[PDB]
Design a protein around this nucleic acid. Structure first.
Ligand SMILES: [Zn+2]
Lengths: 67, 86, 193, 61, 122, 50
RNA sequence: GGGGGACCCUGAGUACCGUCGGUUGGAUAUCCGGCGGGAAGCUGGGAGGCAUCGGCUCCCAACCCUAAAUACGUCCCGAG
RNA sequence: GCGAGGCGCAGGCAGCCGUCGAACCGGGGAUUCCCGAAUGGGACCUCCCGCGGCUUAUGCCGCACUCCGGGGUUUAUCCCCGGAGGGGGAACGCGGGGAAUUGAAACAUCUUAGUACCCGCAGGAAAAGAAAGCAAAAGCGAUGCCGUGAGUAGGGGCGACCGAAAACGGCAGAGGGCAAACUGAACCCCGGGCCGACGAGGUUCGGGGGAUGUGGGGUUGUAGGGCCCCCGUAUGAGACC
C-alpha cells in the first residue's frame, strides 16, 4: 500500500484499515506457528510496515488539519 | 490499552487445542503491560463475544499468556475456526 | 549628599551612634539564621559603590561567619615533623570570600556581585552580599550589568572572580612582587600564595 | 574601523549585540548606537580620546 | 521601639498639620522630595521646614538630618509614615524625608509649625 | 527461588533466550566462519552474572 | 568646539602598622590569610628592594567588562 | 542528488521491494518502552502505589526540593502565573585541601612537591588585561604566548639542591563602563492597541519596580569632571539599526 493512495482516504477509514491490518497481522503470526505451508514469508513484514505508514500519514493529516 | 494492541498471537499448542474443545477456552499471547480488564475488553470487542473469566501468567521466556473462557452461549471452536486455528 | 554622611558615620562605628546601633543589631542578628535575605542594604554608600541598584533582579543577603582560622583534621598515616601542624593555621580564602560562597550555595540561580563588612563581635563576622539574577529582563536590559548574563560568568564567586577573590589571588599587586599572580595562580604552579 | 555589531547568545539562548572595539554587550539597538557614537567618535574625529597615555599612543600612531 | 534619630514626640494633630502643610506647599508652593534632595536643600540653606518619617530602616538614611538642621537653624518635624509622607508629597512611592522651600498658601501654617516645634523641643 | 521479583525474572528470561546455538543456515551463509557466540552457557558450570 | 574661576566630587574596618601560620628566589627587601590597631580623602594620596629625613622621577588603589595572538583533542581531512 | 538494482557484519532457503525512480547519499520531519539529575509518592530487584481538573468512555493536562520576579488568600508559605538551578563530558581551564616512598649515600631544615590524590566551579577555549606599573644620562606605554636574558640576581644543615623578572628581537594588537559632584521621574520590565512594512523606529493603556534615587551626566593626574562666566556653532560632517 502506497502513500499516494493512503492520502486519498480520510482519518476514519485510516483507523479502520489499521484495525483490520492489526487483526490480519495477529492471524498471520498465529498461522506462522500453526503451519509451515507459508507461501509468502514476507507478509508479516509488509503488514507491519503498512500499519506504520498508515499511522505516519494519519499524524501528518492531523498536523495539517490543526495548522 | 487500545483493544487492538493487546493481542500478539493465538496459541496453537496441543494444550491450547485441547482446552478449546474441552473448556470453551481460547489462549492468546498478549502484551505484558495488559491487565485482565484490558484483555477482556479486547477479546469481547474484537470477536463480538462475551467472556466469563480471564487467567493470565508470564512464561519463563518473558511473554504474557492469557486463558480466556467464553460464556456457554458462545463457542470457542467457532472463533478458532474463524481465526484458522482449526 | 547623604552618601558622604553615611560613609562618615560608618568610618569608625565606635565614634558615633553607629556603635550603639550596631550593638543592638548584633544582639538581634545572633538569633537569625547563618544566611538570611534582607530587604535594604545597611551601608547604602558601600552597596552603590560596589554596584547595587534599586530595581528588580538585585537582592541583599547577610551572612554570618565564625572568626579565627582553621584546625586541620588529625593525620592518620605517618607524618614528618614539618607536616604535623594542626591548630595554628589560617584559610587561604578571606572570610568575606567564604561568606560569599555560603550565600551562593543558599541561592543557586543567582550570581554574587560583591559584598561588604557590616559588623563583628568577638565571635562572629557579618557580611552583606549583593546577588544578581542573570535571567531577569531588567538585568538583561541594563547594559551596566547585562554582561553577567553570558555563559562564561557562571560560578564566578566559586572560581574567584569577585573582588574578594581577586584580593585572595593577589591580583591587586602589579609590577615587582606580582610575578607569580598572573595570568592565574595555577598557571604559575600555584606558587604565588 | 568597522563597528558593526556582533551577535552573541545569552544563558537562555537570547540575543545580544557585542561591540567589536570594546566587547560591551547590549540588548537594545538604540543603546548600541549611542555607545558606539559616544565612545568611539574620536576615531572619526567627533571627539577626543580619554587618558593622557592613550592620547600619547594615538599621537605617535 | 522608636528609632534613636528622633528627639521629641510629635502629637498626632501636629503630624497631620505638617502633612497638610506639605500638601498645600506642593500644590501651590515648592517642595523637595527625597532624602538626597532635602539634604542638598538644607545644606544650601533653602529649606524653610524639614519633615522626617519615623519608620526609616536603616536609620543611617536620616541620621544626619536632625544635627544638620540644628546646625543650620532650620525647623524640622517628624511624621509617622513614609507612605503618607510620600503620598502628601505627590509621588507613587514612599518618601523618607521632605523639605518645603516656598510655603505658598501655607506660610502661616509653616510659621505655626515652626513655633510649636521650637516650643516643644526645637 | 520460590518467590521471585518480576525484574529479576525478566532478566533471567532474557539470559535463557540468549542461551542457544548458532543457526545452521547462518553457518552455511557465513561459510563456516561463524560457528558460535560468546553467550553460550551451561547452568551447572557457568553461572549468570546476577 | 574652545578659554577663566573664587565653588563641588573623585571608592574605609580600606591603604597601612605589630604579631602568628603558610607560600615564595624575595634575601631586615615576595604574596595570601587569622588576631589587636587603623588614617588623609584634592589645601589630597601611593611607589622608587632595611628604616627614617630632604631632593628628584613615575603614578592615582581599595568597583566592573574586554576580541586576536595561547592550551587540549572524546572527533574529522592529510602525511609517514 | 544517483540511475537499475536492493533486502547490515553474512557466500543459504523461500519470498517480497523497485521505472508511480528503490537501495544508497546530504537536508528536514514522525515514532521514540522502562530506569537514570529523575521530578506526584515508594523501592530486598529498571517494578509498584496516589491526589486534583478536562474527558460521555475509551483517555488527556498538572502535582518534587532551592530560589527570582508577581498575584490571591486560607496568613497556612496555603494556592495560582512566568522564569531559573541540579546530571553528563577523553584532554585542556579556574579557585581551595594536600602526603610518602625517594635524594641528601644515615637524618630532623630541605628535596621529592604545591607533585600524586581529594573538594568546588566554567567554556569551546578558560584565566589575565588598560598602571596608586615599570625604569633612572634616556625613557617606554593594556594583557597573553614564543626566543633570550639564565642556571644569572637570589634562596639553601649556604649541604644536597632549588631559582626569577625587567630589558631586547618576534605573533597579535583595542580599548571601554560605573560610584560621586550635578539634574530630579524626564526611567526600566511585563501584557494588550495602533502608525510604520511583517522589520528598525514612533506612540497609547493596564500591571510590577522606582525619591533608601529609575533615567540624563560623568570616568581622570604638574590632573579629570561638574557647576557658573565669555567666546564660537549645526544651514554641515559622521557612526550605527
Ligand atoms: Zn565600544
Amino acid at each position: 500500500m502506497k502513500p499516494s493512495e493512503i492520502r486519498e482516504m480520510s482519518i476514519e477509514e485510516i483507523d479502520a484499515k489499521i484495525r483490520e491490518l492489526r487483526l490480519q497481522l495477529a492471524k498471520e503470526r498465529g498461522l506462522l506457528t500453526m503451519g509451515t505451508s507459508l507461501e509468502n514469508p514476507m507478509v508479516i513484514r509488509n503488514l507491519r510496515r503498512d500499519i506504520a505508514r498508515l499511522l505516519t500519514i494519519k499524524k501528518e493529516k492531523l498536523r495539517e488539519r490543526e495548522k | 490499552m487500545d483493544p487492538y494492541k493487546v493481542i500478539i498471537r493465538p496459541v496453537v499448542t496441543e494444550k491450547a487445542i485441547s482446552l478449546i474443545e474441552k473448556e470453551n477456552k481460547l489462549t492468546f499471547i498478549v502484551d505484558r503491560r495488559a491487565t485482565k480488564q484490558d484483555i477482556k475488553r479486547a477479546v469481547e470487542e474484537i470477536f463480538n463475544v462475551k467472556v466469563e473469566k480471564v487467567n493470565t501468567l508470564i512464561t519463563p521466556r518473558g511473554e504474557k499468556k492469557a486463558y480466556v473462557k467464553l460464556k456457554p452461549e458462545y463457542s470457542a471452536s467457532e472463533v478458532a475456526a474463524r481465526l484458522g486455528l482449526f | 549628599g547623604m552618601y558622604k554622611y553615611i560613609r562618615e558615620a560608618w568610618k569608625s562605628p565606635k565614634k558615633s551612634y553607629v556603635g550603639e546601633l550596631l550593638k543592638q543589631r548584633m544582639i538581634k542578628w545572633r538569633r537569625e539564621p547563618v544566611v538570611v535575605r534582607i530587604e535594604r542594604p545597611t551601608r547604602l554608600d558601600r552597596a552603590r559603590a560596589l554596584g547595587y541598584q534599586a530595581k528588580q533582579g538585585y537582592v541583599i543577603v547577610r551572612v554570618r561567619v565564625r572568626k579565627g582560622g582553621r584546625k586541620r583534621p588529625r593525620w592518620k598515616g605517618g607524618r614528618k615533623p614539618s607536616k604535623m601542624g594542626q591548630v595554628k593555621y589560617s584559610p587561604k580564602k578571606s572570610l568575606q570570600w567564604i561568606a560569599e560562597e555560603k550565600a551562593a550555595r543558599k541561592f543557586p540561580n543567582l550570581e554574587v556581585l560583591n559584598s561588604y563588612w557590616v559588623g563583628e563581635d568577638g565571635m562572629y563576622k557579618w557580611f552583606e552580599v549583593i546577588m544578581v539574577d542573570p535571567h531577569h529582563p531588567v538585568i538583561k536590559s541594563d547594559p551596566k550589568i547585562a554582561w553577567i548574563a553570558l555563559k562564561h560568568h557562571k560560578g564566578r564567586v566559586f572560581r574567584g572572580l569577585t573582588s574578594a577573590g581577586k584580593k585572595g589571588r593577589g591580583l591587586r599587586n602589579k609590577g615587582k612582587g606580582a610575578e607569580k599572580v598572573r595570568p592565574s595562580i595555577r598557571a604559575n604552579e600555584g606558587k604565588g600564595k | 574601523v568597522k563597528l558593526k555589531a556582533i551577535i552573541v547568545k545569552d544563558r537562555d539562548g537570547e540575543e545580544f549585540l557585542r561591540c567589536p572595539r570594546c566587547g560591551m554587550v547590549f540588548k537594545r539597538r538604540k543603546d548600541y548606537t549611542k555607545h558606539v557614537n559616544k565612545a568611539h567618535g574620536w576615531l572619526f574625529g567627533r571627539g577626543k580620546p580619554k587618558g593622557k597615555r592613550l592620547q600619547k599612543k594615538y599621537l605617535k600612531a | 521601639a522608636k528609632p534613636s534619630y528622633v528627639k521629641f514626640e510629635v502629637p498626632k494633630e501636629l503630624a497631620e498639620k505638617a502633612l497638610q502643610a506639605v500638601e498645600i506647599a506642593r500644590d501651590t508652593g515648592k517642595i523637595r522630595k527625597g532624602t538626597n534632595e532635602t539634604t542638598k536643600a538644607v545644606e544650601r540653606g533653602q529649606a524653610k521646614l524639614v519633615i522626617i518619617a519615623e519608620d526609616v530602616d536603616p536609620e543611617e538614611i536620616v541620621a544626619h538630618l536632625p544635627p544638620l538642621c540644628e546646625e543650620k537653624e532650620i525647623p524640622y518635624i517628624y511624621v509617622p509614615s513614609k507612605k503618607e509622607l510620600g503620598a502628601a508629597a505627590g509621588i507613587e512611592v514612599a518618601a523618607a524625608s521632605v523639605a518645603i522651600i516656598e510655603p505658598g498658601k501655607a506660610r502661616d501654617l509653616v510659621e505655626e509649625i515652626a513655633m510649636k516645634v521650637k516650643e516643644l523641643m526645637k | 527461588a520460590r518467590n521471585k521479583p518480576l525484574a529479576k525474572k525478566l532478566r533471567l528470561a532474557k539470559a535463557l533466550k540468549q542461551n542457544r546455538r548458532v543457526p545452521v543456515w547462518v553457518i552455511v551463509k557465513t561459510n563456516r566462519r561463524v560457528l558460535t557466540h560468546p553467550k553460550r552457557r551451561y547452568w551447572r558450570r557457568t553461572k549468570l552474572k546476577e
